[PDB]
């Protein structure tokens, strides 16, 4: 169960040359041991491209041995009786080897056979989870997506809470993996209550990831409570450096300590965002998005501020602040201007009946267009 | 201000504190957003049903 | 077979399809701002602190 | 082998022919022949390919021919003559029945049942000409024949519905010769092409044929566009008479495109926005109308940027039209970043591609738009800014120059600012809270009126088919 | 309602067609 | 097709023609006329003399009046009969700028009025101000008078109820739609 997810999570780090060259070569040790032990040989060939014949001779041997054993065993099983349960169990076991070697193709054949045959509802759900897990190993979004739909057909028939925890978290990784964080936060905070490590990245990872998503999604009170008043995160302390950085960030956002906000922002980038396979792609949007949320927050409470004041609080020069503010303003989240010659920062205040007016017409505009498009269509008939 | 317990705005360069005790925005306009909101879902459904005819 | 007359008539008004003519003949830009920010934070800091 | 397939092909045409003949010759049931006639064209063009294409030859031989035989010989002559029993009337299987046309009585001139059959033959030939890709002698001969053939008649409304198709191929064939190949004579016969379209157009009001009239206006406008007579097009459309009543929504999309194009170059972008969006909707979105769509989506973007609106970057990405809209994508960004120099290189680089669609001349105007946009960014970001700072920001030469850009721009209300000379800075003046003002009232009023128009269109359409059904016997 | 009248109308095209076949027998 | 259907005389004649259109300030026809002309002036007369109006359109679209103005004066070395449009085109520049400067501000000193509008004489400046229906008093323009006066005058006319739009009218029009 454990090697299935661990091989891929560890190997990622080595791949990256984003990381320091020194860090990159330490990862190499761990990854290398598990290539040979688990015989990852077809896939390994792929993976050497991206950065002893014995491994592979071993593969041929192991393969042949294992094959030969189980072959005539399954040929004997056919002569013999029970095809529902016992042959299905063996067919699962062929797939287990296939999943060991990194061919997604060959596991999917055998494990389908099990489903075909009439089995326990509990048993059904199980088998479909494993098929979808094979997608994570490579990290493909399209394959994962389609498999997890089926799982929901059987999920309430079995009605187990045991495997629905596994289901919640699988869909979580699919979401994390893509840019959208809204969905992830909702499943991954829940996994704090109940986690199962089975074919799933360890609980400590889930603690860190839950916290990142947390920040991005919930508004003040709610979000704060979810990412702080959680008993679980306090009990777990700061046991690894990465979980520390993110929590430090959370403290500073909430506490409105804006001097330490910026140091904490930089740490989270180096040690949270990049180790993460999922948020590697999304590093760019994430870190930038935080500078905007935090700035908005300070401005909300202030009619006006000075540039010199604002600048000082964060720990950047006055010039730097201005430049970085001029990015945020037309995009619009800050809702602000800078009256430059005076050096004051004004915050436009249309929060009222005017606000509600403007929003409401735009939403009306959206309904108006759809009606036309549909109208015109039917009208031709 | 941020907790919201007197919910006003601090004017820093004029060094005065503006206090507004005005409650949350008008109910009527917000209830319109909810009505228009449903109607979008009504129309999506209406087009699928109508696809057969086209 | 009715709609078909029209589809062919439009294509002809275009001439071929340009669509395939082009390959034969031949804030998404925003850099990670983390790298630049690192430099900014540090220079301001040095002076601020030892002022 | 040959004989078999040719015959089979022949049979199929003959079946179709008799049915549409019956319908027209049994009172005016107009809609039924028309819907049928469009589908038959597709079917015929698709047929020809297999079952051999000498289906035509066979059918000509076996009618009460007038000069179809003479025509057919010209067609065989272009593409090398053969004889294998192709003598006119070598086939008699008509055999004195009114149904396939009584042989004796037609010849005498006591009946003339040849009328619509000759019209139909001309349609089959035209169609076959363009499919094949046979040109030169035939096109000329064909154009020649058909124009006096139509002017012999004094058409019925039903017969006019049929020449509503024939003129599109007439137009298109003339163009193909003109487009291949430089001639003084092409230029000369362009004048004559216009003249005849215009003559037929006057007639089709009186004849009360909405279908024909529409078609002609599509052609004539397209003609003005190619030779670049904008002035001619602008005059022609304003004696507007183009109906949306009987016409295909295929035709509507073409019509509205021409509107949009002529508005584009004289700087009217308000009217051009609406007409363009409509042609997109109107057009059947299919695999082979995809050419039309591509041309149009390149224009729609231009119209928007000129107005000052900024098209999504998302739109070009998720479309299956990505590669063709590669130049476009570069313009959209270039206006956004406000970089003049990059804009200048970009249009030079893409010069050949843009030039074909003739959107190039629009692009040249897009040079102003880059600069103007950069002055909005600065106003929004910084409410009060010394005029010195803008100059550095947009790389502009001196204080006097930026004076002059803002000053022209605020006449148009793009920036919406006022320069304060005395203080030596610029003040944004748009500062919202237009709620308090009478303004939302104005806004909603337009929406209310617009709903009402959609109601009347809805009400109107719905009831009409029931009326016809209810009258007719039905179980 | 626009949609509902058009479903009805499409249906009745088929009924109108079959109607003729029934009358043939009757005659 | 070419056989003698272009000449040096053609090129000169079209330039002069386009300059008349710029002087009437009919940017509507100019752009259309350019489309008709297009293929002939692309590279078969090129841009040599025809270049003079093409350049001229470009700087006034950008709204750098500084560039535009400079081109007309320097046009002295290009005059061959071009002066019949060139003299006029100065005047056209003065009215466009004059319009602009109202919306910006109310007060300009004497010097500044002269500099933007490109008068060479300060007295001629004050003279132009009366003709432009602006009073300059004690070295300051008072754009404030006429502009307000014009709007008040515009307000009396006859077209006028539906164009101005009455709120009363909105209820009356809505009802008769329904009940028809």
- Closest to A214 in 3D by CA, of A196, A239, A192, A238: A192
Q: Rounded to the nearest 5 degrees, what angle is found at the Cα of F15, between the Cα atoms of F10 and F20?
A: 125
- Closest to F53 in 3D by CA, of F26, F43, F66: F26
- The answer to whether residue C32 sits within a structural domain is yes
Distance from CA of D451 to the nearest CA of A (A): 9
CB F137 within 8 A of CB F124: no
- Closest to A295 in 3D by CA, of A272, A311, A279: A311
- Closest to E20 in 3D by CA, of D472, A369, D283: D472
- Closest to C18 in 3D by CA, of D299, D347, D293: D293
Rounded to whole angstroms, the Cα distance separating A115 from A133 reads 16
Domain span including residue C46: 7-51
- Closest to A151 in 3D by CA, of A177, A136, A172, A130: A130
CB D207 within 8 A of CB D160: yes
For chain D, list the contacting chains (3+ Cβ pairs, <8 Å): A, C, E, F
- Closest to D366 in 3D by CA, of F56, B20, F61, A73: F61
A200-218 burial, b at 16+ Cβ within 10 Å, e below that, comes to bbeeebbbbbbbbbbbbbb
At which residue do the structure tokens 């031949």 appear? Answer: C26
Query: Chain A residue closest to E2 (CA)?
Result: A378
Rounded to whole angstroms, the Cα distance separating E1 from F84 reads 69
Chain B partners of A363 at a C-beta cutoff of 8 Å? 33, 36-37
Rounded to whole angstroms, the Cα distance separating D261 from D300 reads 10
Tokens of residue A256, six digits? 């409105």
| A340 in reach of chain D (CB within 8 A) | yes
Rounded to whole angstroms, the Cα distance separating D158 from D120 reads 13
Select from D266, D365, D400 the Cβ nearest to the Cβ of F66: D400
DSSP readout, C1-51?
A: -HHHHHHHHHHHHH-TTSTTHHHHH---S---SHHHHHHHHHHHHHHHHT-
Full strand arrangement of the beta sheet holding D382-386: B16-18, B9-11, A302-306, A344-347, A336-339, D382-386, D425-428, D417-420
At which residue do the structure tokens 């390959």 appear? Answer: C23
Distance from CA of A169 to the nearest CA of B (A): 30
Select from F35, F39, F104 the Cβ nearest to the Cβ of D265: F35
For D474, the 3-state DSSP assignment is: coil
* Count of all residues that appear for chain F in the document: 180
What φ, ψ does residue A16 adopt, rounded to 5°? Answer: -60, 140
CA torsion E1-E5-E11-E15 (nearest 10°) is: 150
CB D454 within 8 A of CB A375: yes
DSSP readout, D337-384?
A: HT-HHHHHHHHHHTHHHHHHTT-HHHHHHHHHHHHHHHHHHHHHHEEE
Q: Quote the number of domains for chain C.
A: 1
Exposure on the CB side of residue D355, measured as CA atoms within 13 A: 9
Report resolution (Å) to 1 decimal: 4.5
Find how far residue D37's CA is from the centre of its chain. 20
Query: Chain C residue closest to A311 (CA)?
Result: C44
DSSP readout, A45-111?
A: HHHHH---THHHHHHHHHHHHHHHHHHHHHHHHHHSS-TTTHHHHHHHHHHHHHHHHT-HHHHHHHH
CB D311 within 8 A of CB D305: yes
Rounded to whole angstroms, the Cα distance separating A287 from A269 reads 7
Rounded to whole angstroms, the Cα distance separating B39 from F145 reads 52
Instruction: Name the method of structure determination.
Output: cryo-EM
Rounded to whole angstroms, the Cα distance separating A10 from A28 reads 9
- The answer to whether residue C34 sits within a structural domain is yes
Pairing relation of β-strands B9-11 and A302-306? Answer: parallel
Count of CB contacts below 8 A, A vs B?
A: 71
Pairing relation of β-strands B16-18 and A336-339? Answer: unpaired
Query: Chain A residue closest to B16 (CA)?
Result: A303
Q: What is the DSSP letter of A246?
A: H
| E12 in reach of chain A (CB within 8 A) | no
Q: What is the 3-state secondary structure (H, E, C) of D99-143?
A: CCCCHHHHHHCCCCCCHHHHHHHHHHHHHHHHHHCCCHHHHHHHH
Tokens of residue C11, six digits? 């294509």
| E25 in reach of chain D (CB within 8 A) | no
Q: Where are the domains of chain F?
A: 1-144
- Closest to D110 in 3D by CA, of D67, D64, D161, D51: D64
CB A145 within 8 A of CB A182: no
DSSP readout, D211-242?
A: HHHHHHHHHHHHHHHHHT-HHHHHHHHHT---
Cα→Cα distances D135→A171, B38, D226, Å: 63, 59, 21
Rounded to whole angstroms, the Cα distance separating D428 from D419 reads 9
CB A316 within 8 A of CB A266: no
CB B47 within 8 A of CB A374: yes
| C17 in reach of chain D (CB within 8 A) | yes
Chain D partners of A326 at a C-beta cutoff of 8 Å? 381-382
* Count of all residues that appear for chain A in the document: 381
Tokens of residue D338, six digits? 């406000």
CB D221 within 8 A of CB D239: no
Interface with chain E: mutation pick from A372, A377, A381, highest number of E CBs within 10 Å? A381
Tokens of residue F61, six digits? 């679209």
- The answer to whether residue C42 sits within a structural domain is yes
CB A193 within 8 A of CB A208: no
Tokens of residue D401, six digits? 């120059």
Pairing relation of β-strands A302-306 and A344-347? Answer: antiparallel
Q: Answer whether D231 sits within 8 Å of F108, measured CB to CB.
A: no
Query: Chain B residue closest to E6 (CA)?
Result: B53
Torsion-angle region of D473 (φ positive above 0: left; ψ -120 to 50: alpha; else: beta):
beta
Q: Answer whether E15 sits within 8 Å of D474, measured CB to CB.
A: yes
Interface with chain A: mutation pick from D283, D383, D425, D430, highest number of A CBs within 10 Å? D383
Alpha helices in chain F (DSSP H): 8-24, 27-37, 51-62, 65-74, 83-104, 110-117, 122-131, 144-154, 161-164, 167-178
| D235 in reach of chain F (CB within 8 A) | no
Rounded to whole angstroms, the Cα distance separating A346 from D384 reads 11
Q: Answer whether A283 sits within 8 Å of C41, measured CB to CB.
A: no
| C39 in reach of chain A (CB within 8 A) | no
| A381 in reach of chain E (CB within 8 A) | yes
- The answer to whether residue C33 sits within a structural domain is yes
Distance from CA of C30 to the nearest CA of D (A): 11
For B18, the 3-state DSSP assignment is: strand
| E6 in reach of chain B (CB within 8 A) | yes
Interface with chain D: mutation pick from F33, F104, F105, F107, highest number of D CBs within 10 Å? F104
Rounded to whole angstroms, the Cα distance separating D227 from F41 reads 14
Chain B partners of E10 at a C-beta cutoff of 8 Å? 53
Q: What is the DSSP letter of B14?
A: T
């Amino acid at each position: 169960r454990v090697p299935n997810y661990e091989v891929s999570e560890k190997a990622f780090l080595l791949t990256q040359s984003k990381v320091s060259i020194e860090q990159r070569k330490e990862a190499a040790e761990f990854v290398l041991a598990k290539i040979k032990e688990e015989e990852m040989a077809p896939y390994y060939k792929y993976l050497c491209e991206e950065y002893d014949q014995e491994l592979y001779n071993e593969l041929c041997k192991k393969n042949e041995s294992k094959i030969k054993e189980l072959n005539e065993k399954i040929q004997k099983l056919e002569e013999d009786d029970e095809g529902e349960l016992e042959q299905a169990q063996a067919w699962i076991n062929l797939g287990e080897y296939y999943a060991q070697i990194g061919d997604k193709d060959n596991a999917e054949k055998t494990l389908g056979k099990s489903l075909s045959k009439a089995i326990s509802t509990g048993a059904k759900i199980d088998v479909m989870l494993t098929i979808a897990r094979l997608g994570f190993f490579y990290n493909d979004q399209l394959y994962v997506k389609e498999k997890l739909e089926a799982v929901n057909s059987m999920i309430e028939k079995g009605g187990d809470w045991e495997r629905r925890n596994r289901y919640k978290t699988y869909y979580g990784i699919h979401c994390l993996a893509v840019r959208n964080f809204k969905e992830a936060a909702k499943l991954l905070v829940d996994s704090l209550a109940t986690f199962t490590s089975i074919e799933l990245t360890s609980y400590e990872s889930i603690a860190t990831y839950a916290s990142v998503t947390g920040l991005f999604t919930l508004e003040r009170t709610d979000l704060k409570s979810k990412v702080i008043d959680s008993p679980e995160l306090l009990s777990l302390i700061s046991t690894t450096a990465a979980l520390q950085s993110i929590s430090s960030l959370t403290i500073s956002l909430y506490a409105s300590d804006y001097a330490s906000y910026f140091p904490y922002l930089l740490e989270t980038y180096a040690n949270v965002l990049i180790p993460c396979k999922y948020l590697n792609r999304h590093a760019d949007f994430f870190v930038r998005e935080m500078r905007r949320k935090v700035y908005a927050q300070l401005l909300e409470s202030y009619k006006t501020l000075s540039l010199k004041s604002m600048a000082s609080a964060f720990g950047v020069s006055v010039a730097f602040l201005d430049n970085d503010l001029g990015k945020f303003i037309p995009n619009k989240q800050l809702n602000c201007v800078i009256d430059r010659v005076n050096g004051i920062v004004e915050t436009n205040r249309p929060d009222n009946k005017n606000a509600q007016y403007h929003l409401l017409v735009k939403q009306g505009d959206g309904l108006l267009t759809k009606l036309q498009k549909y109208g015109a269509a039917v009208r031709l008939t | 201000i941020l907790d919201k317990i007197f919910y006003g705005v601090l004017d820093q360069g004029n060094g005065w504190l503006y206090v507004y005790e005005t409650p949350n925005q008008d109910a009527t306009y917000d209830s319109a957003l909810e009505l228009v909101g449903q109607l979008n879902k009504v129309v999506d459904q209406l087009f699928e049903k109508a696809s057969v005819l086209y | 077979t009715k709609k078909k007359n029209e589809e062919i008539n439009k294509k002809s008004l275009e001439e071929d399809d340009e669509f395939e003519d082009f390959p034969i003949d031949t804030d998404d830009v925003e850099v990670d701002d983390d790298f630049t920010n690192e430099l900014k934070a540090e220079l301001d800091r040095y002076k601020r602190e030892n002022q | 082998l040959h004989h078999s397939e040719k015959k089979y092909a022949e049979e199929d045409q003959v079946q179709e022919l008799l049915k549409v003949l019956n319908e027209i010759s049994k009172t005016t049931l107009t809609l039924d022949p028309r819907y049928i006639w469009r589908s038959l064209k597709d079917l015929s063009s698709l047929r020809n390919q297999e079952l051999l294409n000498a289906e035509t030859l066979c059918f000509t031989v076996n009618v009460l021919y007038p000069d179809s035989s003479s025509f057919k010989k010209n067609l065989l002559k272009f593409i090398t003559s053969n004889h294998k029993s192709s003598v006119p009337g070598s086939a008699e299987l008509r055999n004195s029945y009114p149904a396939s046309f009584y042989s004796v009585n037609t010849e005498k001139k006591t009946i003339e049942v040849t009328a619509e059959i000759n019209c139909f033959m001309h349609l089959l030939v035209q169609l076959f000409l363009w499919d094949s890709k046979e040109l030169e002698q035939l096109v000329e001969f064909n154009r020649k024949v058909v124009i006096p053939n139509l002017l012999c008649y004094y058409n019925l409304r039903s017969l006019n519905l049929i020449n509503a198709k024939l003129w599109f191929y007439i137009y298109l064939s003339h163009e193909t010769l003109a487009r291949s190949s430089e001639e003084i004579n092409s230029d000369n016969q362009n004048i004559i092409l216009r003249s005849t379209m215009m003559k037929f157009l006057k007639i089709a009001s009186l004849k009360h044929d909405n279908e024909t009239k529409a078609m002609l206006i599509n052609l004539i406008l397209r003609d003005f566009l190619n030779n670049g007579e904008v002035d001619s097009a602008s005059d022609f459309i304003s004696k507007l008479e183009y109906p949306h009543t009987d016409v295909s929504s295929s035709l509507e999309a073409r019509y509205f495109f021409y509107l949009s194009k002529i508005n584009a170059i004289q700087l009217d972008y308000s009217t051009a926005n609406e007409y363009i969006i409509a042609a997109i909707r109107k057009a059947p979105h299919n695999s082979k109308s995809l050419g039309f769509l591509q041309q149009s989506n390149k224009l729609h973007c231009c119209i928007q940027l000129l107005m000052g609106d900024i098209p999504e970057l998302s739109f070009f990405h998720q479309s299956n039209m990505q590669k063709s809209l590669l130049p476009y994508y570069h313009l959209t960004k270039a206006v956004k970043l406000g970089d003049l120099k990059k804009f200048t290189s970009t249009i030079t680089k893409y010069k050949q591609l843009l030039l074909k669609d003739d959107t190039y001349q629009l692009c040249v105007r897009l040079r102003s738009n880059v600069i103007k946009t950069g002055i909005r960014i600065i106003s929004l970001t910084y409410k009060k800014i010394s005029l010195r700072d803008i100059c550095l920001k947009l790389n502009l030469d001196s204080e006097q120059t930026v004076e002059y850009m803002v000053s022209r721009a605020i006449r148009d209300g793009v920036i919406e600012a006022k320069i304060n000379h005395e203080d030596g800075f610029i003040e944004t003046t748009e500062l919202l809270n237009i709620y308090d003002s009478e303004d939302p009232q104005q806004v909603f009023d337009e929406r209310i009126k617009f709903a009402n128009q959609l109601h009347d269109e809805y009400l109107v359409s719905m009831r009409y088919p029931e009326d016809k059904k209810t009258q007719q016997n039905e179980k | 309602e626009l949609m509902v009248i058009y479903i009805s109308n499409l249906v009745r095209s088929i009924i109108a067609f079959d109607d003729l076949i029934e009358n043939k027998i009757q005659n | 097709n070419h056989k003698l259907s272009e000449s040096d005389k053609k090129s000169k004649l079209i330039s002069l023609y386009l300059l008349n259109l710029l002087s009437q300030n009919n940017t509507t026809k100019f752009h259309s006329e350019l489309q008709y002309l297009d293929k002939h002036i692309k590279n078969l007369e090129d841009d040599s003399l025809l270049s003079y109006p093409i350049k001229l359109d470009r700087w006034l679209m950008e709204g750098s009046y500084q560039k535009a103005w400079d081109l007309l004066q320097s046009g002295s070395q290009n005059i061959s009969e071009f002066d019949s449009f060139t003299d006029i085109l100065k005047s056209a520049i003065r009215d466009e700028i004059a319009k602009n400067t109202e919306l910006s501000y109310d007060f300009l000193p004497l010097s500044n009025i002269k500099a933007l509008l490109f008068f060479n004489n300060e007295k001629e400046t004050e003279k132009f101000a009366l003709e432009r229906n602006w009073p300059i008093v004690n070295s300051k323009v008072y754009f404030n008078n006429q502009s307000k006066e014009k709007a008040d005058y515009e307000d009396e006319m006859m077209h006028e109820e539906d164009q101005k739009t009455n709120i009363i009218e909105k209820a009356m029009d809505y009802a008769i739609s329904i009940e028809n």
